[PDB]
Design a protein around this ligand. Structure first.
Ligand code: D16
Length: 220
């Protein structure tokens, strides 16, 4: 699997590269996408079908995955997880809370960012430092965006505070293979959590594979 490249008996994952036809949401999930468009409908369903494959293999029976604070996914009790999707990928990674404090993942196509995006999602330092050490064959701007989204998704559940794109400083290192590596996200705002020790440094992994950028953060 692709997501295995960016992950370190309490963690499961599942991914699919297309929308399997005929899949249907759970009954009390249905009103969430009654008015949604077809393309949104498919990835809503496919990613929750991936989520329940992983959740079942952690002895958790299928349960509805609703959306809460700023659309945040909701999980069965004692559970945490993360959902992601893009043009050719649907994936979920889930974990039990005591072993996994939080999960954050993202998947993106390995293409240049649309015009004007690199500036909103990034700091003057990240833009000077990343081109010095990232391999020439990589879209460091897109990989930066993927790492940014994977950080807020792992950050937000533990603080329920909004993490702007310029409240996190991400530094990258490239593994000797050249297409994979890992990063450190440093929080520039208060790291007060609702529970647990403060959180200011998040370590995650990044990978480029099959034309796709994958990132994941697992906070033990
Ligand atoms: C810049 C920024 N900072 C934040 O802290 C932030 C927080 C949220 C709230 N949050 C934590 C989430 C909202 C949506 C999620 C998610 O995992 N979406 C999946 C599945 C969506 C679905 O099918 O319902 C996805 O992107 O596919 S996670 C959303 C955008 C943010 N953006």
């Amino acid at each position: 699997t692709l997501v295995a490249s960016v992950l370190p008996e309490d963690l499961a994952y599942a991914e699919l590269y297309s929308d399997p036809p005929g899949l249907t949401p759970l009954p009390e999930e249905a009103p969430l996408i009654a008015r949604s468009v077809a393309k949104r409908r498919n990835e809503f369903i496919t990613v929750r079908h991936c989520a329940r494959i992983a959740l079942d293999q952690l002895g958790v029976p299928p349960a509805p995955i609703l959306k809460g604070d700023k659309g945040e996914p909701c999980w069965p009790d004692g559970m945490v997880g993360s959902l992601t999707h893009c043009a050719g990928y649907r994936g979920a990674v889930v974990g039990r809370r005591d072993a996994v404090r939080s999960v954050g993942i993202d998947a993106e196509p390995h293409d240049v960012l649309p015009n004007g995006v690199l500036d909103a999602i990034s700091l003057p330092a990240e833009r000077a430092d990343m081109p010095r050490t990232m391999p020439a064959a990589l879209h460091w701007d897109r990989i930066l965006f993927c790492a940014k989204e994977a950080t807020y998704k792992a950050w937000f559940p533990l603080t329920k505070r909004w993490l702007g794109f310029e409240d996190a400083h991400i530094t990258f290192e490239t593994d000797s293979t050249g297409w994979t590596g890992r990063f450190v996200s440093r929080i520039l705002i208060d790291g007060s959590t609702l529970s647990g020790p403060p959180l200011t440094t998040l370590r995650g992994r990044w990978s480029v594979e099959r034309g796709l950028v994958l990132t994941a953060i697992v906070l033990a």
